[PDB]
Scaffold this active site. Sequence first.
Site, PDB file in Angstrom:
ATOM      1  N   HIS A  61       0.788  -1.319  -0.063  1.00  0.00           N
ATOM      2  CA  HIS A  61       0.098  -0.338  -0.042  1.00  0.00           C
ATOM      3  C   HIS A  61       0.708   1.022   0.075  1.00  0.00           C
ATOM      4  CE1 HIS A  61      -0.677  -1.774   4.277  1.00  0.00           C
ATOM      5  NE2 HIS A  61      -0.096  -0.057   4.688  1.00  0.00           N
ATOM      6  N   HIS A  91       6.585   7.365   5.338  1.00  0.00           N
ATOM      7  CA  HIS A  91       5.932   6.997   3.397  1.00  0.00           C
ATOM      8  C   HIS A  91       5.203   7.720   3.447  1.00  0.00           C
ATOM      9  CE1 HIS A  91       3.009   6.461   7.962  1.00  0.00           C
ATOM     10  NE2 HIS A  91       1.324   6.649   5.914  1.00  0.00           N
ATOM     11  N   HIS A  93       2.075   9.379   0.882  1.00  0.00           N
ATOM     12  CA  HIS A  93       0.891   8.864  -0.371  1.00  0.00           C
ATOM     13  C   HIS A  93       0.484   9.712  -1.604  1.00  0.00           C
ATOM     14  CE1 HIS A  93      -0.719   7.484   3.665  1.00  0.00           C
ATOM     15  NE2 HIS A  93      -0.098   7.904   3.742  1.00  0.00           N
ATOM     16  N   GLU A 103      -3.670  13.522   1.958  1.00  0.00           N
ATOM     17  CA  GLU A 103      -4.356  12.925   2.903  1.00  0.00           C
ATOM     18  C   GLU A 103      -4.645  14.024   3.069  1.00  0.00           C
ATOM     19  OE1 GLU A 103      -2.312   9.519   4.587  1.00  0.00           O
ATOM     20  OE2 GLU A 103      -4.698   7.763   3.292  1.00  0.00           O
ATOM     21  N   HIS A 116       4.381  11.096   5.295  1.00  0.00           N
ATOM     22  CA  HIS A 116       4.102  10.667   6.816  1.00  0.00           C
ATOM     23  C   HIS A 116       4.853  10.221   7.634  1.00  0.00           C
ATOM     24  CE1 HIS A 116      -0.731  10.434   6.210  1.00  0.00           C
ATOM     25  NE2 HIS A 116      -0.028  11.924   5.767  1.00  0.00           N
ATOM     26  N   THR A 195      -4.735   6.428   9.054  1.00  0.00           N
ATOM     27  CA  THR A 195      -5.724   6.711   7.984  1.00  0.00           C
ATOM     28  C   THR A 195      -5.683   5.318   6.899  1.00  0.00           C
ATOM     29  OG1 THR A 195      -3.665   7.116   6.583  1.00  0.00           O
ATOM     30  CG2 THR A 195      -4.862   9.541   7.319  1.00  0.00           C
ATOM     31  N   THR A 196      -5.055   4.124   7.114  1.00  0.00           N
ATOM     32  CA  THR A 196      -5.098   3.192   6.750  1.00  0.00           C
ATOM     33  C   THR A 196      -5.653   2.377   7.759  1.00  0.00           C
ATOM     34  OG1 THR A 196      -2.927   2.219   7.485  1.00  0.00           O
ATOM     35  CG2 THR A 196      -3.218   3.248   4.907  1.00  0.00           C
TER      36      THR A 196
HETATM   37  N1  LIG Z   1      -0.639   7.212   7.436  1.00  0.00           N
HETATM   38  S1  LIG Z   1      -0.851   7.044   9.060  1.00  0.00           S
HETATM   39  O1  LIG Z   1       0.370   8.038   8.900  1.00  0.00           O
HETATM   40  O2  LIG Z   1      -2.321   7.753   9.397  1.00  0.00           O
HETATM   41  C1  LIG Z   1      -0.228   5.214   9.499  1.00  0.00           C
HETATM   42  C2  LIG Z   1       0.936   5.156  10.708  1.00  0.00           C
HETATM   43  C3  LIG Z   1       1.035   4.183  10.783  1.00  0.00           C
HETATM   44  C4  LIG Z   1       0.455   3.206  10.388  1.00  0.00           C
HETATM   45  S2  LIG Z   1       0.614   1.247  10.913  1.00  0.00           S
HETATM   46  C5  LIG Z   1      -0.443   0.256  10.486  1.00  0.00           C
HETATM   47  C6  LIG Z   1      -1.026   0.419  11.736  1.00  0.00           C
HETATM   48  C7  LIG Z   1      -0.417  -1.131  12.751  1.00  0.00           C
HETATM   49  C8  LIG Z   1      -0.240  -1.530  12.120  1.00  0.00           C
HETATM   50  C9  LIG Z   1       0.852  -2.892  12.925  1.00  0.00           C
HETATM   51  C10 LIG Z   1      -0.274  -2.759  14.744  1.00  0.00           C
HETATM   52  C11 LIG Z   1      -1.220  -2.154  14.820  1.00  0.00           C
HETATM   53  C12 LIG Z   1      -1.147  -1.386  13.935  1.00  0.00           C
HETATM   54  C13 LIG Z   1      -0.280   3.176   9.764  1.00  0.00           C
HETATM   55  C14 LIG Z   1      -0.968   3.912   9.168  1.00  0.00           C
HETATM   56 ZN   LIG Z   2       0.274   7.552   6.017  1.00  0.00          ZN
END
Ligand SMILES: NS(=O)(=O)c1ccc(SCCc2ccccc2)cc1
Ligand SMILES: [Zn+2]
Length: 257
Positions: A61, A91, A93, A103, A116, A195-196
């Site tokens: 992703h 990472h 988007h 986002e 992010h 956000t995922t």
């Molecule tokens: N786009 S974002 O910055 O909001 C963002 C940051 C970190 C993660 S990590 C996946 C969630 C997760 C992974 C492993 C164990 C528990 C939860 C997902 C999305």
């Molecule tokens: Zn992100």
Amino acid sequence: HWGYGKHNGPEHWHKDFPIAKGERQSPVDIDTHTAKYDPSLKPLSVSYDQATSLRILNNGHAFNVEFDDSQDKAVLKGGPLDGTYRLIQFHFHWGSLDGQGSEHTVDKKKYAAELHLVHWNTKYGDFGKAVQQPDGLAVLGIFLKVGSAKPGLQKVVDVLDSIKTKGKSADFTNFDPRGLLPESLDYWTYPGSLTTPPLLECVTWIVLKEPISVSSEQVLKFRKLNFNGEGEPEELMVDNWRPAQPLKNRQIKASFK
Ligand SMILES: NS(=O)(=O)c1ccc(SCCc2ccccc2)cc1
Ligand SMILES: [Zn+2]
């Protein structure tokens, strides 16, 4: 099976992840005329001089640049935050087109991409425990626009050939994330979520007002990535962004007048 296609995209996520329609989901639109200056917010403190990058991963992703977070080497403090938050990964988007990809939006404006930098609260011991806490993560969001190249992004761009497909990783040591920051650390802040999926409501969001510029050639290289694994039909990793979610009972605060 969640993703960003027509059949499994953001409008579908609530069926596996009911928190998708929760009270503090991200991203949001930042309405600049309604965010309130909060003169009690401190300057953000970004301490990245000791950062130790390790690896870069295509996880189907996005791609994550991962850091050694087993000591206080790269930390975010101050701003709205209490305590010390360790950098675990960053990472991006991005869009299929320069006119979309971020986002967060600013007065409904979409940027070409959004970085992010993800950090976790050291009082919780590890990332997996931190995502279970309302103040467990701090994510620093930085908008990208297309224009001049960002020299400090090029090392990332140049390794993407080697992690084209889902599950691929490559050594990525000695990368300095200070080369991805804009000049100003002026920011907006609000409480929100990943956000995922699993969309956990564990994030203090700190979104910088000043975007970085990247070159058209730089973003074109992001768009060559694949969502699929090797030996599966090619689907370009583009438009891996969730759209703005309802603000509900939240105020966005600004660090600046
Ligand atoms: N786009 S974002 O910055 O909001 C963002 C940051 C970190 C993660 S990590 C996946 C969630 C997760 C992974 C492993 C164990 C528990 C939860 C997902 C999305
Ligand atoms: Zn992100």
